[PDB]
């Protein structure tokens, strides 16, 4: 995948979305995110995976201060709320707007209208890995029909009977928790579903073309090596698109077959 | 008992120099007592009213459906003042009321109110205005049916 074509596509689609928005103008340009669309030669996963995978970016996403971050932890929520009040830096303290444990989530948000209100009150949801398996039932199809706001897995376990939440929270150190939270809020999300098409966030409209190209190439790199099964001979096509623009091709293969054994005369 | 540990905990809090509101939370209980419930209905604070069907004397609750209808309160007549007393830790409760519930039970309270409105009030809206009683005895009905049968035959 050549990067000159990637950057040329970046200026092309940026000029296109600018001339489309020109037809507040600056606000209409802003909050328009950029989608990286991968087409594969096979379904990327054999079943619906509801835990999104994280890709680390040199230029993090969600750096704006207006976002709302909702954190879901294990019991109790008291330890984490006092942690938010005392020992996080001010930027993360302002970014995190709600901390709620799994027990209170199941107690207060069993209603579909409650789930939709929680969906609309926040932009990005982070969730501890100790409880993320029970969250599809607790949050329903509201949080999982659309892959935009699926809970991002974070590790809050202190890495090594029934645990009493009031006595101990099994707490892992808080500055490295801060590092984990900023890593998760900066990482992009990839969602595995039984599909030949997947979509990954790489940037926004007002971002500049060379950081867009760097994000695109690195997201392609870890996406191919780590999560796409059978790697490049399973990779079929790569596209970059906006919410209202068409596909912009970046890499189109010469073969249409995963392997030569599929070729039967 | 629970009031005793609550007062002991508030005593410890005021001993170490904190307000009782710092250690105690806002309670959510079923409101009961006839004068209390009537005042809540008049002040439009009660969200749901349950009235016992067997209050003796009946004048204590005979105006409560009309009061609830004027003030727009969802009301329901239920069987058992002793059944309400089991709720309110008494032998007998003539009327109970919900003003507010917790955030975990907003939906359940709203669904119960809607179920009451659609399954009791709409079904008794026209039967509440009719006169009751007037049932004849067994022998009186048999004699009347025999008399009407004889009149039809003759």
């Amino acid at each position: 995948v050549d990067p000159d074509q990637t950057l040329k596509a970046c200026k092309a689609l940026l000029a296109h979305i600018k001339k489309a928005a020109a037809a507040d103008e600056e606000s209409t340009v802003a909050e328009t995110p950029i989608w990286l669309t991968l087409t594969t030669k096979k379904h990327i996963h054999d079943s619906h995976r509801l835990q999104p995978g994280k890709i680390i970016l040199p230029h993090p996403l969600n750096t704006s201060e207006e976002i709302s971050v909702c954190l879901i932890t294990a019991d109790p929520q008291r330890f984490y709320k006092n942690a938010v009040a005392d020992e996080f830096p001010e930027d993360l303290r302002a970014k995190i707007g709600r901390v709620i444990d799994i027990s209170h989530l199941k107690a207060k948000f069993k209603a579909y209208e409650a789930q939709r209100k929680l969906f609309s009150e926040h932009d990005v949801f982070l969730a501890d890995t100790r409880i993320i398996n029970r969250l599809p039932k607790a949050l329903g199809k509201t949080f999982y029909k659309t892959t935009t706001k699926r809970p991002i897995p974070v590790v809050l376990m202190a890495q090594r009977e029934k645990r009493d939440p009031l006595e101990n929270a099994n707490a892992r150190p808080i500055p490295e928790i801060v590092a984990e939270i900023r890593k998760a809020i900066g990482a992009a999300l990839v969602h595995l579903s039984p599909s030949t098409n997947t979509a990954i966030k790489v940037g926004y409209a007002n971002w500049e073309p060379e950081k867009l190209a760097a994000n695109i190439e690195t997201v392609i790199r870890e996406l191919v090596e780590r999560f796409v099964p059978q790697k490049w001979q399973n990779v079929r096509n790569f596209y970059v698109k906006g919410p209202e623009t068409a596909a912009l091709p970046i890499y189109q293969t010469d073969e249409l077959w995963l392997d030569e054994s599929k070729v039967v005369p | 008992q629970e009031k005793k540990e609550r007062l002991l905990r508030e005593a410890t809090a005021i001993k170490e120099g904190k307000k009782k509101e710092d250690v105690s939370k806002k309670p959510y209980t079923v409101k009961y007592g006839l004068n209390h419930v009537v005042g809540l209905i008049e002040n439009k604070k009660a969200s749901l009213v349950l009235i016992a069907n067997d209050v003796d004397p009946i004048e204590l609750v005979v105006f409560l459906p009309a009061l609830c209808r004027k003030m727009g309160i969802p009301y329901a007549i239920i069987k058992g003042k002793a059944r309400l007393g089991t709720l309110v830790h008494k032998k007998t409760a003539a009327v109970v009321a919900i003003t507010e519930v917790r955030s975990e039970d907003k939906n359940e309270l709203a669904k119960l109110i809607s179920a009451v409105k659609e399954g009791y009030l709409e079904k008794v809206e026209d039967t509440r205005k009719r006169w009751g009683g007037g049932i004849m005895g067994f022998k009186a009905q048999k004699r009347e049916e025999k008399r009407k049968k004889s009149l039809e035959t003759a």
């Binding site: 209603a111 209208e113 409650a114 209100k117 | 005042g39 008049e42 002040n43 439009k44 969200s47 004027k70 003030m71 727009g72 309160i73 507010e100 907003k106 939906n107 309270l109 709203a110 669904k111 109110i113 809607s114």
Partner: peptide, 23 residues
């Protein structure tokens, strides 16, 4: 707001009758 909260808070158009001013 919530539909459940609106259902709980739904009342009639008659003004509330107060016996006395409450602190």
């Amino acid at each position: 707001g919530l539909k459940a909260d609106e259902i709980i808070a739904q009342r009639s158009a008659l003004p509330a009758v107060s016996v006395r001013k409450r602190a």
